[PDB]
Design a protein around this ligand. Structure first.
Ligand SMILES: CC(C)(O)[C@H](F)CNC(=O)c1cnc(-c2ccc3cc(C#N)cnn23)cc1N[C@H]1CC[C@H](c2cnn(C(F)F)c2)CC1
Length: 291
């Protein structure tokens, strides 16, 4: 098991400049956020780190469970396509998780060219998809269901190696149900939206990510018609549209054969009936044959 450093909260306040909320793009410390909390940049002993400060739908006890679960999963799972936890703080009424900093942020943000990063090439997108599937495969081989696969949780290091993140909702792998449905609605399998817990839902959410990679479009955009990227996929499969109509135009190296090949993988991942989807091992093989 990996051993982690227990920081005092006041130390993490110092390294994040008191959790400075200005974007790092203008010299602040804020890197991203959501319902989970906020992630900040800092330096610990010259090491660049990401500090996730958890925010309070969920009881304090429940939030503590997700904090404990992330530490337990990260203690057991070390792999080059997973992020790496360094430490944590839990003194007082705050919970912080400290990771090795990811120089290229999230896949979601690089697909939207947030803060002016250059568009990803098709060649790079294929390698990122393969890397992400390799990380999910490691998780599933070690009997963890992620439950929140999405492009915001696929991070990118300096060489754009893909790294799965956010294991606070992970569960061990009859039909297992829960009374507390969690996840990000635009990526979830239908059975996951109704309380089922199964690794086959990770495959469905990964299919949505493949659509984000092909199109450059986020899974949901309230200002778009259709708002949901899954609705766009139904227009293709019902033949009013083709996947070539939606290929990201911010690419100059997308050949149609491999694009249709990864769309084929996504379409198999997106089967409504969970038992017709490939398992992650098959998804790995299909993505390797595409390149
Ligand atoms: C191009 C640049 C120079 O600007 C470049 F980008 C800067 N580097 C970063 O920005 C950045 C750097 N290292 C991390 C990092 C490393 C390990 C972990 C683990 C965990 C968890 N657990 C979260 N981060 N992390 C994350 C980063 N950025 C995320 C973007 C997505 C955000 C997010 C997650 N979910 N949501 C929403 F869907 F809820 C939004 C969270 C921060």
């Amino acid at each position: 098991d990996t051993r982690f450093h227990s920081f005092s909260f006041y130390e993490l306040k110092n390294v994040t400049n008191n959790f400075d909320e200005r974007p790092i793009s203008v010299g602040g410390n804020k890197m991203g956020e959501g319902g989970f909390g906020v992630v900040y940049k800092g330096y610990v002993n010259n090491t660049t780190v990401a500090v996730k400060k958890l925010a309070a739908d969920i009881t304090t006890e429940e939030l503590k469970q997700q904090f404990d679960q992330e530490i337990k999963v990260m203690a057991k799972c070390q792999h080059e396509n997973l992020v790496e936890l360094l430490g944590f703080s839990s003194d007082g009424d705050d919970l912080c998780l400290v990771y090795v900093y990811m120089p290229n942020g999230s896949l979601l943000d690089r697909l939207s060219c947030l803060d002016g990063t250059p568009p990803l090439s098709w060649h790079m997108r294929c390698k990122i998809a393969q890397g992400a599937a390799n990380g999910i495969n490691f998780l599933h081989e070690n009997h963890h269901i992620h439950r929140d696969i999405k492009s915001a949780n696929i991070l990118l290091d300096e060489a754009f190696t893909a790294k799965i993140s956010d294991f606070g909702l992970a569960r061990a792998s009859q039909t297992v149900m829960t009374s507390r449905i969690v996840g990000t609605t635009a990526y979830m399998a239908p059975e996951a939206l109704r309380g089922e817990i199964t690794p086959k839902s990770d495959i469905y959410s990964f299919g949505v990510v493949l659509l984000e990679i092909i199109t450059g479009l986020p899974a949901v955009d309230e200002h778009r018609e259709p708002q949901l990227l899954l609705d766009i996929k139904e227009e293709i499969e019902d033949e009013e549209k083709t996947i070539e109509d939606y290929i990201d135009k911010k690419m100059n190296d997308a050949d149609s054969t491999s694009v249709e090949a990864m769309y084929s993988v996504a379409s198999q991942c997106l089967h409504e009936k969970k038992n017709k989807r490939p398992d992650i091992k098959k998804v790995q093989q299909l993505l390797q044959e595409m390149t």
